[PDB]
């Protein structure tokens, strides 16, 4: 069987529109947005996610990344060659 191509919600995550039926999450410590729809996080940012691991990924034309991953209250990012942490609330 051929594996599925992607998730089509990541185009709306790239554009910035939240998926329908989802709820917002509060992200502190950096420039990122997150939503929770089906016990999965959707993250829109231009940083590089390092530690927790993601399931699917898309990239826009101007360098914005969209991620599909499991829920977690912490993210490890690299900003400009320096490693820091982002804190996620509302889970």
């Amino acid at each position: 069987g051929i594996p599925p191509s992607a998730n089509d919600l990541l185009l709306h995550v790239l554009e910035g529109v939240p998926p329908p039926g989802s709820r917002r999450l509060v992200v502190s410590g950096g420039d990122a947005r997150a939503w929770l729809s089906n016990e999965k996080m959707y993250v829109r940012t231009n940083l590089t996610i390092l530690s927790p691991g993601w399931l699917a990924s898309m990239t826009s034309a101007d360098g914005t990344h969209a991620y599909e991953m499991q829920k977690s209250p912490v993210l490890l990012v690299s900003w400009h060659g320096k490693v820091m942490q982002l804190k996620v609330e509302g889970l």
């Binding site: 594996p3 191509s5 992607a6 990541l10 185009l11 990924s57 826009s60």
Partner: peptide, 22 residues
């Protein structure tokens, strides 16, 4: 129309699906 670039999906273990543009 909506555009995506450099798409990767980890469907499960042992197999992945990638695409250039969508």
């Amino acid at each position: 129309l909506l555009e995506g670039r450099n798409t990767l999906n980890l469907a499960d273990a042992q197999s992945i699906r990638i695409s250039d543009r969508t």
